[PDB]
């Protein structure tokens, strides 16, 4: 048991702070938007008007969370670090790319305080079901924060284990994974969302034939298929079952032509693209699939009038 | 509970009968390879030694199920048919084409027998799992058929329930579907292949990018110096995360049984080919799809001479 | 010099006679529509009011070329092949698929009939400048057929020769070119298309990429607050670099008329559609030919329902 | 006719003091390796033994012309600078990614010096043809540096003028171009990089389609073509030709099956991908050109190894 700080109160601060106090932990929330903070008060959590209250109410060693937008990190860092000490923990959860986490824990480390990276994954269902945790950073300090990670990870219970599993040791098992030093734990969640673009869009894609399997030689093109019962059907004995099958399946269940639904993507498919071309990893489907996202907004215009022009 | 016989008895044949008996049905086998037949004869299986005692020993309206190799399967009927009788129905249940299907179904109702085409997914794990079934064909043959298919599919204890399901009906829960009319099955197998296909070439392309995340062209090598453990990472992405799935699982035990992956050029049986070809005729854009089955023909290194003929260019220039 | 029969009166095909005659040789024309016979006939071209009278036109062994859209040939066949005779000489320059020439090849043979395919590339251009031709069917035929060839071809002219092409001989460098047996034309002419398209998307897509370089997520706003000249800098990519091509000269034009393209979906005809699907039986990569392809369909809206279901998952998680 | 000092002996270095010299300016020349710097004094050009002489024998305003290794430029620049003068002009025209340029610019204007980015088409071939030239910085020295493009550049005669024109005014026509401010001409020859991969793995992969088309329905595929003939061919007429094409047709004569030729690339083609994924446009042929460089070096092995594994 523990006490830790959390700073950014949106849905994913405010969810992790109820999953870390019903885990037996006491939290300090703080928030720029009091709003925020006060939903929490309401709730029995210990607010702070200000970083210097919320820094004030940390017992040392300290163990701050970070869940706040990507761009307002370093400023939070700035206004706060003054106030923190040695052998304090500061934790950024969010969504920052792993460089930023680089530079952040080498400033971090020249006085004294340990910089943890966590990519974070499960969105609103971590609250009950526990959040998937990538983790970068020293040793030393992800070894005291395992009873943080432990209380917001999914336990192994979460799912059956893998034939052989015993033969190895570590937390993977868990749902939370210490990926190696600083940024680690943001690289192997950037590519995680890399991965889910690509699924997602290969599940898309197919259930696109699907749909028009009745474009109709026509004769062959005459099938006017089920799409909820179908992706239904799929998600038992087939190869391709799978979490994102589910969501598939309930959505379509409720509107079988999506009648009431162009898509944004949020950072981490770009930045594992990316890190593919750094690497010269080929990358065809994650970055069709992220290419796919972009026209769906219109942003393939210009290269279609140019190709009317030609033509 | 009924009388099925079943031609083919490779595994995915074998595995059905012995589910099939295993569930309460009579089975009796056969195959141009004797070897095989005697093997589950073996097993106390009923066997035939030629296609006519197959046919005598099963009583009519006969349940014929194929699991043969595509290519085999039109031979099979021009030998087999002569021997069957109105109100009979042959399934296949391997690897067509659906056009075929749609050929195949108009010939044997011209001779009063139902053709029906199943899509089967599942393989080795659907003996002790059941199939995930896809069913094409006429209703009333696929509604006279539904006991085969209850015991041959999972069964809706397999996976928990869709918000909403029991706002509906029809046979989906239990893991298997009269997807339409001949050729339907196929059609919707071949697209769960293709989708397959897409899948595994998300994971192992981002598999790869992690694998090369010690790299350190290349402006910072300090941004590229992890050694990630890609078992370990598999294995946690199993709980909690978006990206679950049964190919990840399976992703999971292979590096942990391999971390380097080093004992093991990729094939491609078809259904992926098929499906970009149903998406270029459609019109429906497929660049995940196609590039996932293009990586799998460059890894066989069809790509060597376009690959020259850049270098060739290069050299040029 | 010969006596070409052209069927099929559009802007192709009046614009092949005026190039024929122009040339030389003497053509007969005809097409289903009588408005268009009439102002070829006006052009002083010997016209003909049916398919009779045609053929009765036309000294054996006949010369028939066929410029009509590919839905319409069979019937063309059909309706003419009963008036023509042994050692006539019938092509099809449109844009048929190279597997229907292989057929029809067949069946023409049979009545002692050479069928020869021609793709032709060049358009508007050719009537002026000469029509690239790719030639599929029998040597002997396309011997025969070579003055109209000529006429029809740009000539060596057209484009500095490439070193070391005194050592070889065939027609090549008079821009056309016997490819191989029946289909050969088209199947050749198809993969031009295909290649034309990836063209088109490289070069429209490095464009998008420069029109969006004045986009200042997005962490650098100042790396991105160019406003470039579109027009002048394909002007300028003419000269002197390394993707200098017609399509950049058709590109620079159009710009030039307008900076925005304001005035102006994009439409596919088939050969793209045809590339790719040969690409897939013969398990040929071709990520950027079927990218390029894929980007049409979605410039339609195809891709519509893959997105409202990527918008659905992400209201589901 | 001016004064240009060039610095960085190499074949393009070399080259474009060969073509300014053959047009009637003065050239001094310097490099780190004195061989290189001594071949061109054996061919009658002025050298410098070090970048002290080197600036010493350029007359004020001075031109100053890089063409070093990318990663070479900014220690150059700092050797160098404190020997400049207020009113000299930089110019770096080798392969630099255009934001170090923007910083570069930035850091020389605080000492009076304008850092003009130039690139450079054309290759060997410039020597005698003349280069493509995408130019970025104030237009003061841009103008100023006329009379060096207008040697360096193809002039108009390297083609047939478009149809219009003449309604615009610039050098656009001569084979050269101010692109911009600065940056804006190294990225103007990133996206035509970028550009000339994809037309490459166009024609690649459709030469690729017919060299299989006698993969043999078998029947449909016994096609033995001539990829020489054809691409000979393709180049009057067809809508397909192109510099490129003629490069095509020359080797594939040479050696039909091109058995004495793995895939490098240098940068932009990277660059061009990442610049794609920060604005947010489609960028599918020009990134499945690069990930085919990048899989024909076997960068793909361990995903092929994955595949099969799963299968």
Redesign the interface.
Known sequence: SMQIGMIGLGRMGADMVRRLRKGGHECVVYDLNVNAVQALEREGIAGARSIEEFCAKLVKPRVVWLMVPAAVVDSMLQRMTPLLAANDIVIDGGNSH??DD?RRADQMRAQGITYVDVGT??????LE??????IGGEKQAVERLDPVFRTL????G??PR????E??E?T??????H???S??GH??KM???????????????????????N?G?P???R????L???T????????????????????????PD??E???SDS?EG?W??????????????????????????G??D??????????
Chains 1, 4 share one sequence.
């Not at 990870?153 to 192994?156: E, H, L, Q, S, Y």
């Not at 893998?162 to 599993?165: K, V």
């Not at 993977?172 to 994974?177: C, R, T």
């Open positions: 792993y460089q680089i994954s499960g969105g609103i269902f971590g079901r526990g959040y998937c945790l990538m990870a999914p336990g192994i979460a799912a893998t034939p052989g599993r033969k190895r570590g993977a098992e868990l749902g939370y994974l990926c190696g030093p940024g680690a690289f192997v590519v995680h969302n890399g991965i889910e673009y690509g699924l997602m869009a290969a599940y898309a894609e197919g259930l696109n034939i699907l749909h028009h399997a474009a030689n004769d062959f093109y099938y006017d298929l089920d909820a019962d179908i239904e059907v799929w998600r038992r004995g087939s190869v391709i079952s799978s979490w994102l099958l589910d969501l598939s399946a309930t959505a379509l269940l409720d509107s999506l009648q639904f162009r898509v950072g770009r594992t693209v990316a890190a593919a071309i750094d690497e010269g990893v080929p990358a065809h489907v994650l970055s069709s699939a992220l290419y796919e996202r972009f026209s769906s907004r942003e393939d210009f290269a279609n009038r140019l190709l009317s022009a030609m033509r």
